[PDB]
């Protein structure tokens, strides 16, 4: 029961599909993100809204794996109740900001090199 990533575009109907699998069987985990970054698939900034049906049995878990794979749905996250997961996530996020500034300076080098090359 972990909130995934869906672009709020097929949520009313993906809920219908999750119901046709098992109608109102288990808890629904909800989340929402605004003004998201350019997507890895197309680069769009479509807003995200997600409602997730999850099953603890093995077969039904695999069934929902198949269902979410049959649609554009990302279920990568695997959190954990202890706070250590969130602490490591925050450290990773600091590394993410480091990658961001690294991207900035690499672009700086790229542009200066291109200007040098184009001058001649």
């Amino acid at each position: 029961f972990v909130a995934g990533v869906i672009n709020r575009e097929r949520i009313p109907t993906f809920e219908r599909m999750l119901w046709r699998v098992c109608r109102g069987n288990v808890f629904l985990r909800q989340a929402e993100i605004e003004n998201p970054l350019e997507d890895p698939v197309t680069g769009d900034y479509v807003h995200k809204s997600v409602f997730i049906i999850f099953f603890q049995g093995d077969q039904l878990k695999n069934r929902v794996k198949k269902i979410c794979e049959g649609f554009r749905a990302s279920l990568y996250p695997c959190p954990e109740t202890p706070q250590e997961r969130k602490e490591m996530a925050s450290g990773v996020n600091t590394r993410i900001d480091d990658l961001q500034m690294v991207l900035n300076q690499t672009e700086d080098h790229r542009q200066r090199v291109l200007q040098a090359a184009a001058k001649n």
Binding site: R16, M17, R20, C22, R23, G57, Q59, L60
Partner: protein
């Protein structure tokens, strides 16, 4: 023979009992038939394996239907005093489809009450595979019999050029016990009846003049006997082929003709001897299948039931005979009864109530 086995979630058992009985609770103002129904059941504590069983049971019911259809195709093949409308719905356990479904129960002999449903499905699987093995073996026997009978019929088919002359050649005109003479069983067209009879006189030496006489008359030609010396046959046939004549050397021997007649007689006897016990054993299979099938369907209904609501065995079994060109109102009233209760919010997609097709 359209019918539907309807299941109710069972909010209050008496309420659903009244739903499955009265004329008002019967849709279309009782233009259809809503008969109650009940069976013994069993408890399952794990739903993962239950939905596994649901999928394999949908597949199982599938090939089960395929098998008894094949059966009905075999019934139409044999035609052993049985027509597609006469004894079409054999009265299994002495009763037809509707009375059987209303009267249906868990087969105690096939399984006890407490046998886990998965094991019961396994037992049904073993039984149906055994039935299918018997079906293909019986099919092989019938195919052998039918092919041999068709060959027997083909023995007596065709013109006199290529058909067995077993009923034709006679000893009196067919010269045996003589190293000198020998009878050519010439084939002469009726339009050329007198013609080739006349020209056979002088096709070769060492010949008997104009012995060409009719043996047996066919539609377009007729076999005929010509008596002449043995080495006369060579020149006779050569000059025959020169003048567009036909000569067939069908050798006479009585014993194989007798043997073939007794062969077709004994194969007819084998045919009826197989067809009797065959139709008996096929009645047995029809009953056994049909029973196991309604059990399969009832089990699958119970599976969907336990899937689609809470933990107890709140569930009522029903049979439906939909009214003609009024199933739309049936379905609409069923929606008005059940869909609003299906959930606080609201086919393969949406399916607030359960009901599954039958047509024998």
């Amino acid at each position: 023979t359209e019918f539907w086995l309807i299941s109710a979630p069972g909010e209050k058992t008496c309420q659903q009992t009244w739903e499955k009985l009265h004329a008002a609770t019967t849709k279309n103002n009782n233009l259809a038939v809503s008969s109650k129904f009940n069976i013994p059941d069993l408890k399952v504590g794990t739903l993962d394996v239950l939905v596994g069983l649901s999928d394999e049971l949908a597949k199982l019911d599938a090939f089960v239907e395929g098998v008894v259809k094949k059966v009905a195709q075999y019934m139409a093949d044999v035609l052993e005093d049985s027509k597609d409308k006469v004894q079409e719905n054999l009265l299994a356990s002495g009763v037809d489809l509707v009375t059987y479904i209303t009267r249906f129960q868990w087969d105690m002999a096939k399984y006890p009450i407490k046998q886990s449903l998965k094991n019961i499905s396994e037992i049904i699987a073993k039984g149906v595979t055994q039935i299918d093995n018997d079906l293909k073996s019986r099919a092989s026997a019938y195919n052998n019999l039918k092919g041999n009978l068709q060959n027997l019929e083909r023995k007596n088919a065709g013109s006199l050029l290529t058909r067995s002359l077993a009923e034709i050649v006679k000893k009196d005109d067919f010269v045996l016990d003589s190293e000198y003479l020998v009878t050519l069983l010439v084939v002469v067209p009726k339009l050329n009846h007198n013609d080739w009879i006349k020209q056979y006189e002088t096709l070769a030496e060492m010949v008997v003049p104009r012995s060409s006489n009719v043996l047996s008359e066919d539609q377009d030609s007729y076999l005929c006997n010509v008596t002449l010396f043995r080495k006369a046959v060579d020149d006779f046939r050569h000059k025959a082929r020169e003048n567009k004549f036909i000569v067939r050397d069908f050798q006479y021997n009585e014993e194989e003709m007798k043997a073939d007649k007794e062969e077709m007689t004994r194969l007819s006897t084998d045919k009826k001897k197989q067809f009797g016990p065959l139709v008996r054993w096929l009645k047995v299979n029809f009953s056994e299948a049909f029973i196991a099938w309604i059990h399969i369907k009832a089990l699958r209904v119970f599976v969907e039931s336990v899937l689609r609501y809470g933990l107890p065995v709140n569930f009522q079994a029903m049979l439906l005979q939909p009214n003609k060109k009024s199933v739309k109102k049936l379905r609409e009233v069923l929606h008005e009864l059940y869909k609003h209760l299906d959930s606080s919010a609201a086919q393969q997609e949406y399916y607030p109530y359960v009901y599954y097709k039958i047509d024998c």
